[PDB]
From Swiss-Prot, chain A:
Keywords: Cytoplasm, DNA-directed RNA polymerase, Nucleus, Phosphoprotein, Transcription, Zinc. One of its GO terms (biological process) is transcription initiation at RNA polymerase III promoter. This is DNA-directed RNA polymerase III subunit RPC3. PANTHER family: DNA-DIRECTED RNA POLYMERASE III SUBUNIT RPC3, RNA POLYMERASE III DNA DIRECTED -RELATED. It comes from Saccharomyces cerevisiae (strain ATCC 204508 / S288c) (Baker's yeast).
Curated annotation (Swiss-Prot), chain B:
Component of the RNA polymerase III (Pol III) complex consisting of 17 subunits. This is DNA-directed RNA polymerase III subunit RPC7. The chain holds residues 36 to 70 of 251 of the full protein. DNA-dependent RNA polymerase catalyzes the transcription of DNA into RNA using the four ribonucleoside triphosphates as substrates. Specific peripheric component of RNA polymerase III which synthesizes small RNAs, such as 5S rRNA and tRNAs. C31 is involved in the formation of the initiation complex. Belongs to the eukaryotic RPC7 RNA polymerase subunit family. It comes from the Eukaryota. It is found in: Nucleus. The acidic domain is essential for its function.
From Swiss-Prot, chain C:
Component of the RNA polymerase III (Pol III) complex consisting of 17 subunits. Interacts with BRF1/TDS4. Belongs to the eukaryotic RPC34/RPC39 RNA polymerase subunit family. This is DNA-directed RNA polymerase III subunit RPC6. DNA-dependent RNA polymerase catalyzes the transcription of DNA into RNA using the four ribonucleoside triphosphates as substrates. Specific peripheric component of RNA polymerase III which synthesizes small RNAs, such as 5S rRNA and tRNAs. Involved in recruitment of Pol III to the preinitiation complex. Involved in the configuration of an initiation-competent form of RNA polymerase. It comes from the Eukaryota. It comes from Saccharomyces cerevisiae (strain ATCC 204508 / S288c). It is found in: Nucleus. Disulfide bonds: none annotated. The chain holds residues 169 to 316 of 317 of the full protein.
Length: 534, 35, 99
């Protein structure tokens, strides 16, 4: 299997996904953009081989509907309208996560019990984005026209106003940087003969006003003042029927964030307070700071003074957020006891992780910015002790506090023999947890007359662990579709019926082995989504 | 020939068995849909 | 203390009292079965740090030490009760064979 194990980045993941559940014809083109960056249609056809010009336009509109690319237009002074096409990263994470939203509707919408839209509310997530975009008239004109759909249409504004049903616009069908350029010179529509002096302040008045516009235009999706129309007749409320809307990741990735963040509770406390702290988070993800934080994607991030300001505002918004700062009073009645509130959340103050520590006395909030970076330190070191010896776990903890360690002080700090540590330590230079740094005692950096120092290097240790698993996604997905290449005759025969008595034996083993693939895919994906709090 | 496995290798539980059924009909919906 | 082992067998005694919830530790260690002599407090703060590296024990308030509740782990964040078949199943995941 060496031909895949070496020469394949996460491009091996993305070519597989469009090969997984889509036609074959678009697998080459979606690889061609990300292998090249950006290319428009007039140079697309020459790079690829086997597809014509309008055959691309036949194919390009397929993945355009499923939100797999994000387009853009640019005109020249002498040239015509040129359609530069960019690449979408988060639109295919819907295709990646697509089963886990189905078990997110059930576990987050808990008001209902023994409802007869259980099969139906799972079908709408399979309807809203697998067909591409979605508007209100698309399901109203189905095989059922009226058929008690007032219990279904008014059910959707419960499922829309809880979030993650934002109407799409040009903002979602374009990336984040190319729209920032158009609004940047929109705030530079200033003639230079008004007050020309101190010229370094001229982009300052451009950037501080465009920063307020970028914060405004990112609220235009979240501006829920126009996603809803008051009904004077026969209905309490409904969303506007002329709204074409999809589902996004923003509540889901923050939902999986707290779903991941609840897993440290069952380790750091028992089962009593782990049931308590579930309630303390579920009221907060409706309006939280964004996990991807799109405000820091691309901009003036390179200089330190603006790089300070990207978190000088984020913590002040987080500390002064009304949408999550709970009074620590009303949560007791959400459990299906005011003394038990300030007693079971007393250990939340005394625990060794910075959650529920700094606040006004009496009212609480959940600190975020200093919390998930230790979650990244929590599970990563635990995976180091997983696949090899726990002597590495002793070594992994030893470097962050004994800064720039040597092998002389490693025997005063850690206590093992000199036969098993060097076998374990060398097993961690290979896996990029430690960083060597040699200091010479002679000229020209001679190897023998030199000693060596180590370093933690909290950046490259986690970049390696991210893409070590990103390849491990599609390595299993490549073994999925080769199982469909085998046994390919009877699977179409099992799909034309909607029966040899010995043939059915060879249909069950191929079905249970692929059942373990999607089971183990959810396991490593939870280990991978911890490193997406960047 | 490669040693040193990942520690996530186990029998499927019914907590995720129905969750895995939601994948196989998902791709069949897309391929037997429009495209 | 000395470069050979039985420090690992020494440290398994001192953890047992803290599970049920540093001068108090010196009274705990002196007993019948202990033999190594003079048991200085400089070795106690070093021997206590190893269980922090092994995640068994917690450091709080610059001198207090509490269990990390690894005792219930000692009896997803649980590698035990996770057994692989590893034979006749070709679809397994390894940590090597990407380097």
């Amino acid at each position: 299997s060496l031909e895949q194990r070496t020469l394949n980045p996460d491009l091996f993941l993305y070519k597989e996904l469009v090969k997984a559940h889509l036609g074959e014809r678009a697998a080459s083109v979606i690889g061609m953009l990300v292998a090249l960056g950006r290319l428009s249609v007039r140079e697309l056809v020459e790079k690829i081989d086997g597809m014509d010009v309008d055959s691309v336009k036949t194919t390009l509109v397929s993945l355009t509907q499923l939100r797999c690319v994000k387009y853009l237009q640019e005109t020249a002074i002498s040239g015509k309208k040129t359609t530069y096409y960019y690449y979408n990263e988060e639109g295919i994470h819907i295709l990646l996560y697509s089963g886990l939203i189905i078990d997110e509707i059930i576990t987050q919408m808990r008001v209902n019990d023994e409802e007869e839209h259980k099969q139906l509310v799972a079908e709408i997530v399979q309807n809203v984005i697998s067909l591409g975009s979605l508007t209100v008239e698309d399901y109203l004109s189905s095989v059922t026209s009226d058929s008690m759909k007032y219990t279904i249409s008014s059910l959707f504004v419960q499922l829309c106003e809880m979030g993650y049903l934002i109407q799409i616009s040009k903002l979602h069908y374009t990336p984040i940087e190319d729209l920032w350029q158009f609004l940047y010179e929109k705030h530079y529509k200033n003639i230079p003969r008004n007050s020309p002096l101190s010229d370094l302040k001229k982009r300052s008045q451009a950037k501080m006003n465009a920063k307020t516009d970028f914060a405004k235009i990112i609220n235009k999706p979240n501006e829920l003042s126009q996603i809803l129309t008051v009904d004077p007749k026969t209905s309490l409320r409904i969303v506007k029927p002329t709204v074409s809307l999809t589902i996004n990741l923003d509540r889901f990735m923050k939902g999986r964030r707290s779903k991941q963040l609840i897993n440290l509770a069952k380790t750091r406390v028992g089962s009593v307070t782990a049931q308590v702290y579930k309630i303390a988070l579920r009221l907060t993800e409706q309006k939280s700071p964004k996990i991807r934080d799109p405000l820091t994607q691309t901009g003036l991030l390179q200089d330190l003074e603006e790089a300070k300001s990207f978190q000088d505002e984020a913590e002040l918004v987080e500390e002064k957020t009304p949408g999550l700062t709970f009074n620590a009073i009303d949560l007791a009645r959400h459990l299906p006891s005011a003394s038990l509130i300030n007693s079971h959340l007393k250990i939340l103050a005394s625990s060794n992780f910075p959650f529920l520590n700094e606040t006004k006395p009496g009212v609480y909030y959940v600190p975020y910015s200093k919390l998930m970076p230790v979650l990244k330190s929590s599970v990563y070191e635990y995976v180091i002790a997983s696949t090899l010896g726990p002597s590495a776990m002793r070594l992994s903890r030893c470097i962050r506090d004994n800064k720039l360690v040597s092998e002389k002080i490693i025997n005063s700090t850690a206590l093992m023999k000199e036969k098993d540590i060097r076998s374990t330590l060398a097993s961690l230079i290979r896996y990029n947890s430690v960083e060597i740094q040699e200091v010479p005692r002679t000229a020209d950096r001679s190897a023998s007359r030199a000693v060596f120092l180590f370093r933690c290097k909290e950046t490259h240790s986690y970049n390696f662990m991210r893409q070590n698993l990103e390849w491990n996604m599609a390595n299993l997905l490549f073994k999925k579709e080769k199982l469909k290449q085998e046994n390919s005759t009877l699977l179409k025969k099992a799909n034309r019926d909607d029966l040899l008595p010995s043939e059915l034996n060879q249909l069950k083993m191929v079905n249970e082995r692929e059942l373990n693939v999607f089971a183990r895919l959810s396991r490593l994906l939870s280990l991978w989504e911890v490193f997406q709090m960047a | 020939f490669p040693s040193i496995p990942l520690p996530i290798n186990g029998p499927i539980t019914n907590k995720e068995r129905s969750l895995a059924v939601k994948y196989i009909n998902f791709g069949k919906t897309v391929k037997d849909g429009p495209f | 203390e000395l470069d050979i082992e039985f420090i690992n067998s020494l440290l398994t005694i001192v953890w047992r009292f803290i599970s049920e919830n540093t001068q108090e530790i010196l009274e705990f260690i002196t007993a019948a079965q202990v033999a190594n002599v003079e048991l200085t407090p400089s070795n106690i703060r070093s021997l206590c740090e190893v269980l922090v590296y092994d995640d068994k024990l917690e450091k709080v308030t610059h001198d207090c030490y509490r269990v990390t509740l690894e005792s219930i782990l000692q009896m997803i964040f649980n590698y035990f009760k996770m057994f692989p078949a590893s034979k006749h199943d070709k679809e397994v995941v390894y940590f090597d064979e990407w380097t």
